[PDB]
Design a protein around this ligand. Structure first.
Ligand SMILES: *[C@@H]1O[C@H](CO)[C@@H](O[C@@H]2O[C@H](CO)[C@@H](O[C@@H]3O[C@H](CO[C@H]4O[C@H](CO)[C@@H](O)[C@H](O)[C@@H]4O)[C@@H](O)[C@H](O)[C@@H]3O)[C@H](O)[C@H]2NC(C)=O)[C@H](O)[C@H]1NC(C)=O
Ligand SMILES: *[C@@H]1O[C@H](CO)[C@@H](O[C@@H]2O[C@H](CO)[C@@H](O[C@@H]3O[C@H](CO[C@H]4O[C@H](CO)[C@@H](O)[C@H](O)[C@@H]4O)[C@@H](O)[C@H](O)[C@@H]3O)[C@H](O)[C@H]2NC(C)=O)[C@H](O)[C@H]1NC(C)=O
Lengths: 216, 239, 213, 108
């Protein structure tokens, strides 16, 4: 993993994008790894890391989500990609278009014969000024569900510690969609959208923390 | 809404340089200020239409220039001061005109959120300043003489009396005129300047006022000609 | 560079009339077109963005339409405050460009000018020059003849006219004529007269004064 | 900030009023919020108004949370109402300590 954690590789932190579509039997996380993108936390970080490590692949398939009435591809100087502002490669920061942010309501069926892992997020602004500037609504909401599951997250406005210029945060969540099931994403603000899904596998893959060099 | 105000205009020799500034104030949605928006400089030569010169994105990038000023003018901004700048060099006679800074409507960045729009939209100019006049000429500035245009007995026409100021022999444009420090606005006409054979401009400002109110009240015109640092207040009374 | 051609160059219409302004682009600009109003000596103001959207705060009588190369700005009921110049503007591609403008002019009922004459001030004579001023206030139509007479002698070549822009509220004009002559000449003669001929006056109106009275 | 070389344990809380009256009386805001964070963690709690069973005269409640701050990290507390604030921190140690439930007497 060199300078990257597995979770940073998953999300597509620019300095970790070298790892796009990589596979492993054993992922080796180094103590020198660092994040260099939008500050985030993952409720149940340990589980997401585990399930991805066990899946043993970062194979990602972009899907043609349609986001009507919003601006796409938001970026940040907290997460530079080359010389300019940027963002996680696998996530799509949606904001208002013109003076409105509509209720987004989109669906993506799983018509394949494997499980899809979707990674998405919710933005927590540091201020009301921020909240409304981006999303127009004074308080947002993100609801992501399948035919038998649902997770709803309400963003929470307020300051966190300053990190790479930012007192705001993104929280990362995930949803698995089985063959014949379907994903629905419904949001009226604060959605950090997926760009597609990671293909799930089963097998012998895992992850280990070590600073030992790798020999031939 | 965000508000804009340009400054720095004046008379300069061909070949010289000049730095225009533009200060943003007020605020728009989500308390956004000018530093959230892309901004352009656009100019208007005397009697002509509008000409786009240059654009700069909220974060200072995506700069572009119109051909007529590429290689001579430089656009920049200091977001800590909510200020835009246009540095002009090697000025020529045809750069003469009123310069506006003009805000594009789409939000381009939110610093408190680390957000930046991926692309520079450059959509409609929803806010313009009042403009600043730039004259590129060999002639030196001359400030106006201000003379009263005095109401007289038998001057009544309609049910009204008229009085005014003759602002004579100045260069370059423009002069601003107000009455009683802006307390008097109804019935004021400030005429377009006329170029005289001398090469200097001349203009009159007039106001029509009821005869009675005249006896009872004080009318003074305030003339400002920034290029010559002129600020004159001239009292106008009946002959 | 995309060229925007506006027609007509100038349009005259009566208060209450439905007015249509047109813009043609030299190439397909889709709907990336904005309309501005500029009143004389003032900065432009946005009316319509992206061809058909009414900007917040702009009176609803303004509407915009069209796409590709043909666009229109419609004023459903012309108000006197609508006088000024209207520009279309394109942002499909750099450099951003503006149309050459359409000036809107109100046709109104005749309104005769009120005329005033002013002698030169003492401060000014004191300087070897004499400016005599004639004011025609709030009249329509714009065409007027202002003739100077000094001791009844018809003057020419030593006066200049300036005309205000058509007024935004009542659509009238005002005019000043300035007769300039040296202090010497001003002191030669006695009677200074402004004779105004205008469609709203049945016969010429004269305002005059006697020097030093 | 934690400028010491041991971990600090902060215990804090969020008050849940039984009525809107209470809420506004104490905190002015109609709904409060407490956010406590470090450079890599965050917890935000929104108090929830309504009655619980009467205990020692009371139908309201306090919910207790905790945050550990490592050396070189920092605590930020941000609230517009309902915060039951810490007065300081407990010094964390590692070792052989534990706890047991028993009614057995303690002898010498
Ligand atoms: C809520 O309270 C928070 C805590 O007081 C506030 O967060 C603070 O925000 C300030 C103002 O921008 C930050 O100041 C910046 O700090 C960086 C980093 O400083 C540290 O590192 C530099 C370089 O190594 C060093 O010089 C300093 O001594 C520090 O060690 C500076 O580089 C910037 O110039 C800037 O001053 C604070 O860092 C930040 N504190 C914390 C702990 O987060 C917040 O502003 C408050 N919010 C409101 C709405 O008032
Ligand atoms: C929402 O519903 C709740 C449930 O009905 C209400 O809570 C009740 O509030 C009443 C009024 O304050 C309480 O009544 C008090 O009860 C105590 C304790 O009574 C018990 O113990 C004493 C002494 O041993 C004994 O005498 C009683 O028989 C009981 O065994 C009394 O001491 C007080 O004088 C007083 O009467 C209820 O206790 C309480 N019920 C519960 C289950 O919590 C609540 O008020 C409702 N809210 C609204 C907005 O109306």
């Amino acid at each position: 993993g060199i300078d990257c954690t597995l979770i940073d590789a998953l999300l597509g932190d620019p300095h970790c994008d070298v790892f796009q579509n990589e596979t492993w039997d054993l992922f080796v996380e180094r103590s020198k790894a660092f994040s260099n993108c939008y500050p985030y936390d993952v409720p149940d970080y340990a589980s997401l890391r585990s399930l991805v490590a066990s899946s043993g692949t970062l194979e990602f398939i972009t899907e043609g989500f349609t986001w009507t009435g919003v601006t796409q591809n938001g970026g940040s100087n907290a997460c530079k990609r080359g010389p300019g502002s940027g963002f996680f490669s696998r996530l799509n920061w949606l904001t208002k278009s013109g003076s409105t942010y509509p209720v987004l309501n989109v669906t993506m069926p799983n018509n394949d014969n494997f499980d899809k892992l979707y990674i998405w997020g919710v933005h927590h602004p540091s201020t009301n000024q921020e909240q409304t500037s981006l999303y127009v609504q004074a308080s947002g909401r993100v609801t992501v569900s399948t035919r038998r599951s649902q997770q709803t997250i309400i963003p929470n406005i307020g300051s966190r510690p300053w990190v790479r210029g930012l007192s705001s945060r993104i929280s990362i969540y995930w949803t698995i969609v089985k063959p014949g099931d379907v994903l629905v994403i419904n949001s009226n603000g604060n959605l950090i959208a997926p760009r597609g899904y990671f293909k799930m596998r089963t097998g012998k893959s895992s992850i280990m923390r070590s600073d030992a060099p790798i020999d031939t | 809404q965000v508000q804009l105000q340009e400054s720095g205009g004046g008379l300069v020799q061909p070949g010289e340089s000049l730095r225009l500034s533009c200060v943003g104030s007020g605020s728009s949605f989500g308390e956004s200020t000018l530093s959230y928006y892309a901004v352009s400089w656009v100019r208007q030569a005397p009697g002509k239409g509008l000409e786009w010169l240059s654009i700069i994105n909220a974060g200072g990038g995506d700069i572009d220039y119109a051909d007529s000023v590429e290689g001579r003018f430089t656009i920049s901004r200091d977001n800590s001061k909510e200020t835009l700048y246009l540095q002009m060099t090697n000025l020529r006679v045809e750069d003469t005109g009123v310069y506006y800074c003009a805000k594009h409507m789409s939000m381009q960045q939110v610093v408190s959120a680390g957000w930046e729009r991926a692309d520079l939209v450059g959509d409609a100019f929803d806010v313009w300043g009042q403009g600043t006049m730039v004259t590129v000429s060999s002639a030196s500035t001359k400030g106006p003489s201000v003379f009263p245009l005095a109401p007289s007995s038998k001057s009544t026409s309609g049910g009204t009396a008229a009085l005014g100021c003759l602002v004579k022999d100045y260069f370059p444009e423009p002069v601003t005129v107000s009455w009683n420090s802006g307390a008097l606005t109804s019935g004021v006409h400030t005429f377009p300047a006329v170029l005289q054979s001398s090469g200097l401009y001349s203009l009159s400002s007039v106001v029509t006022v009821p005869s009675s109110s005249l006896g009872t009240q004080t009318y003074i015109c305030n003339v400002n000609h920034k290029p010559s640092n002129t600020k004159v207040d001239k009292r106008v009374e009946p002959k | 560079d995309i060229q925007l051609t506006q027609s007509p160059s100038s349009l005259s219409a009566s208060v209450g009339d439905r007015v249509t302004l047109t813009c043609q682009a030299s190439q397909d600009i889709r709907k990336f077109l904005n309309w501005y109003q500029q009143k004389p000596g003032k900065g432009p103001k946005l009316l319509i963005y992206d061809a058909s959207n009414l900007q917040r705060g702009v009176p609803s009588r303004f509407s915009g339409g069209g796409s590709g190369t043909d666009f229109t700005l419609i004023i459903s009921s012309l108000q006197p405050e609508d006088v000024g110049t209207y520009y279309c503007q394109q942002y499909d591609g750099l450099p951003f460009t503006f149309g050459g403008g359409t000036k809107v002019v109100i046709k109104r009922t005749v309104a005769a000018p009120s005329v005033f004459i002013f002698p030169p001030s003492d401060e000014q004579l004191k300087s070897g020059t004499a400016s005599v001023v004639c004011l025609l206030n709030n009249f329509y139509p714009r065409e007027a003849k202002v003739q100077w007479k000094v001791d009844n002698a018809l003057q020419s070549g030593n006066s200049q006219e300036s005309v205000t822009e058509q007024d935004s509220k009542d659509s009238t004009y005002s005019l000043s004529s300035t007769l300039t002559l040296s202090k010497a000449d001003y002191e030669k003669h006695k009677v200074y007269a402004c004779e105004v001929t205008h469609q709203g006056l049945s016969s010429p109106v004269t305002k005059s004064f006697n020097r030093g009275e």
